[PDB]
Amino acid sequence: SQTQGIQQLLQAEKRAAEKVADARKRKARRLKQAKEEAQMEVEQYRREREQEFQSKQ
Amino acid sequence: ALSDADVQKQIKHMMAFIEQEANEKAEEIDAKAEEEFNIEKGRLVQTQRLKIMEYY
Amino acid sequence: SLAEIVKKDDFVLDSEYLVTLLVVVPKLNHNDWIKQYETLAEMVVPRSSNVLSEDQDSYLCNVTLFRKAVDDFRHKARENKFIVRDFQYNEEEMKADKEEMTRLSTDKKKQFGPLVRWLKVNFSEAFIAWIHIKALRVFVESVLRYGLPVNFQAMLLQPNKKSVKKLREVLHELYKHLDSSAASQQEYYPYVYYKIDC
Numbered sequence: 446s447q448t449q450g451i452q453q454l455l456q457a458e459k460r461a462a463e464k465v466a467d468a469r470k471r472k473a474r475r476l477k478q479a480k481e482e483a484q485m486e487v488e489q490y491r492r493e494r495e496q497e498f499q500s501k502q
Numbered sequence: 503a504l505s506d507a508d509v510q511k512q513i514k515h516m517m518a519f520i521e522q523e524a525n526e527k528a529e530e531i532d533a534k535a536e537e538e539f540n541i542e543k544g545r546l547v548q549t550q551r552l553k554i555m556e557y558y
Numbered sequence: 559s560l561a562e563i564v565k566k567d568d569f570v571l572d573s574e575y576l577v578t579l580l581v582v583v584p585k586l587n588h589n590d591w592i593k594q595y596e597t598l599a600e601m602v603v604p605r606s607s608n609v610l611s612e613d614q615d616s617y618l619c620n621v622t623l624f625r626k627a628v629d630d631f632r633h634k635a636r637e638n639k640f641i642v643r644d645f646q647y648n649e650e651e652m653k654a655d656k657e658e659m660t661r662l663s664t665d666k667k668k669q670f671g672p673l674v675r676w677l678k679v680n681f682s683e684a685f686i687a688w689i690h691i692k693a694l695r696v697f698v699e700s701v702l703r704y705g706l707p708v709n710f711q712a713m714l715l716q717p718n719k720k721s722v723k724k725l726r727e728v729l730h731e732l733y734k735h736l737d738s739s740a741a742s743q744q745e746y747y748p749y750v751y752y753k754i755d756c
Contacts, residue, residue: 446509446603454574457517461524468531472538479539483547487554494558504596504604512604516575 560618560645561652563611568620569647576603576622579631582641584616591619591640598638599623599630616641692752700750710750 560580569578583591591598592607603622610618623631632642693712700710717725733748734741741748 446512447605447608449509450513450603453513453517454572457520458574461520464524464528468528468535471532472535475535475539476542479542480546483543486543487547487550491554498558503592503607504602506604508596508604512601 559651561656563618564645564647566647568608568610570622575624577625577628577644578620578622579628580610580618580620580641580643580645581631581635582616582643583619584639587638588617588619590638591635595621595631598634599627602627602631692754696750696752699752703750 564580568580570576581591595607596602601624606620606622608620610620612618621631636642696712697708700712701708704710730743730748734743736748
């Protein structure tokens, strides 16, 4: 494996870098999606709370 | 002179378990992505819940 | 350390699992090494039977090996009369040492010029003051020999070898009339004497 092993190492380590980048982008995407969905849940329940306060008024 | 047979043995074994452990590490990062997703949605917006509930 | 023998290409580059050990093998069992380097260790680089350079005791050669393979290869090659060495390529280890060698030699010569000038000069004045203190002695001993008055006449001399004793006895004959009694003359000669030799 004088040279062939080096090439296969290069390819496999490129694939490992690619999956690490994929996982990192997955973390960032899920962080953004979590923030967005949790916010939207917050405002829709704000709407229902405001309706309850309208009824109480 | 172990030659191409042992070259293929070393290549297939090493790259195989590299790709395997690579995949499980990525999937574990995805599992922790699920964990931080749920924790954020139940903690940060939940402190927001407490603030707004006190406000109301 | 291998200055003009080993270089970068010999050792493994960007190594993830391997380490290149410069396992020197003599020609007495070189075919042995290239044939059973697999027996020496499992999980080894195929076609790693590479020889770098030559020397009078043996032939330098290197083996690329996983970590456990390095342990096993060392373990079963120390008994195989192979020199073990986990050298790390370092151009600085060569360039530094050679630079200090040449610079220190040149500066040592440039400062040794002053050494010889200073040394020969200072020794010449040292010998000048040397003969001066010797003359001061000659004066003191000649004076006290003849009492207060400082009237005396000094002289260099150079006796012939093997004619020394004849000169001793004729000068004893000459100077024994000054005192006319005893000047067992030995060290304190009937003349005020001092000795010097180069």
